[PDB]
Design a protein around this ligand. Sequence first.
Ligand SMILES: *[C@@H]1O[C@H](CO[C@@H]2O[C@@H](C)[C@@H](O)[C@@H](O)[C@@H]2O)[C@@H](O[C@@H]2O[C@H](CO)[C@@H](O)[C@H](O)[C@H]2NC(C)=O)[C@H](O)[C@H]1NC(C)=O
Ligand SMILES: *[C@@H]1O[C@H](CO[C@H]2O[C@@H](C)[C@@H](O)[C@@H](O)[C@@H]2O)[C@@H](O[C@@H]2O[C@H](CO)[C@@H](O)[C@H](O)[C@H]2NC(C)=O)[C@H](O)[C@H]1NC(C)=O
Ligand SMILES: [Ca+2]
Ligand SMILES: [Ca+2]
Ligand SMILES: [Ca+2]
Ligand SMILES: [Zn+2]
Length: 396
Amino acid sequence: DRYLQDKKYIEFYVIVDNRMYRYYNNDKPAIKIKVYEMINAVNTKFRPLKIHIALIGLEIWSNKDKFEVKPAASVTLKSFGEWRETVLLPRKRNDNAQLLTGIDFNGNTVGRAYIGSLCKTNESVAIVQDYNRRISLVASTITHELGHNLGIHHDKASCICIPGPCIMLKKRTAPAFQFSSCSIREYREYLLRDRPQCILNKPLSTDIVSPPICGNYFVEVGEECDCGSPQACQSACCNAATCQFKGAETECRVAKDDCDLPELCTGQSAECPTDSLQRNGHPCQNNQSYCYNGTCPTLTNQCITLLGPHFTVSPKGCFNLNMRGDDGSFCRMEDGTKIPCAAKDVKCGRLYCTEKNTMSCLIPPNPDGIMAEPGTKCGDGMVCSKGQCVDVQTAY
Ligand SMILES: *[C@@H]1O[C@H](CO[C@@H]2O[C@@H](C)[C@@H](O)[C@@H](O)[C@@H]2O)[C@@H](O[C@@H]2O[C@H](CO)[C@@H](O)[C@H](O)[C@H]2NC(C)=O)[C@H](O)[C@H]1NC(C)=O
Ligand SMILES: *[C@@H]1O[C@H](CO[C@H]2O[C@@H](C)[C@@H](O)[C@@H](O)[C@@H]2O)[C@@H](O[C@@H]2O[C@H](CO)[C@@H](O)[C@H](O)[C@H]2NC(C)=O)[C@H](O)[C@H]1NC(C)=O
Ligand SMILES: [Ca+2]
Ligand SMILES: [Ca+2]
Ligand SMILES: [Ca+2]
Ligand SMILES: [Zn+2]
């Protein structure tokens, strides 16, 4: 079962601590645009994992911190977890929170996270130092720490990735863009074993506090559809560049033949409508079929497929042999044992073929052998069904 398979979503809450606010020269606007750009970069790295980070809360501690932030990363992480559980969570629902801090952590530590703790009330939390002007680098630490919360440990010496480092390398000095196959595996297992429920619901576009981003695969305020870039877009009825529905004149799947219906964009959805077919019983090929499962079965075409372009259905009188019910000329019951045909049913029994314009009765040699296919027209307003010649409207 899946999971696994389904697009997942994290209702993500961010705190910018008072040290970071000071380090940003008290500039809220500059702080917010930085966090927006980092979150979008985190979503780009998480995309192959089918997990989208939806920003639904941002606090900037412009006056004072709400709990004590301390340079021992493990002590802050445990304090943040507790604050999240005891203070935030009763008032603001969220799957996971990160603290972005301007404190300088002990040693060369740049963040810390609990492992595989999505949805836990005390542990779904990570801390991250804003330790470089380059979001390319802080955003990788943000993705790496969240990587830890989603059950992934550090890459062992033998993972993977080309070119730049893997996101879960314990130590990087360049931006990281992809997870190792080993990270990908461990996450897939995390999900199977812990089955974190809270990452299954899709958040409302109106609860996202980050500005809309056209091309992030999540439909936000002022967007109708979002399928990524014009070149990646697999949605036939979305104009990727503008995140807008294509118009309803736009054909998206032409009728392949006459037992087919064309699809057009609806004008108010992103995907090409599923492939509807012409209705069963519908006349086709110049009044020669019925339609059946989007196909037009005919005795002549069955002769042609069996024996080739030089043949057609035999003249009508040949089919009367089938009233014999002997070893060559017969009908079959639904189960389907050999029976003589009733007179009305003869064209639904053994098939007879002839060379074009020649009046013979021949039988394509066949161990079974061959009878009219289901829905084959056997007379006007009639088609073969369970070895019998019957009316539309059964239909079907
Ligand atoms: C945070 O989460 C759980 C604590 O949940 C506890 O579950 C009960 C056992 C009970 O004692 C509750 O009051 C607690 O809140 C800790 O992980 C463990 O969870 C399982 C399942 O309940 C249990 O078998 C373990 O013994 C729990 N650990 C304990 C009680 O020592 C987890 O370690 C906690 N981490 C922090 C930092 O609080
Ligand atoms: C013609 O189709 C029907 C089922 O209707 C559609 O849906 C798909 C499952 C597929 O078969 C497609 O070609 C078709 O347009 C088949 O009839 C049976 O009906 C049930 C329920 O309606 C289906 O779930 C079954 O797959 C099928 N039963 C069995 C055991 O045969 C039908 O088989 C098919 N035409 C033939 C005879 O090949
Ligand atoms: Ca959720
Ligand atoms: Ca979007
Ligand atoms: Ca169609
Ligand atoms: Zn790590």
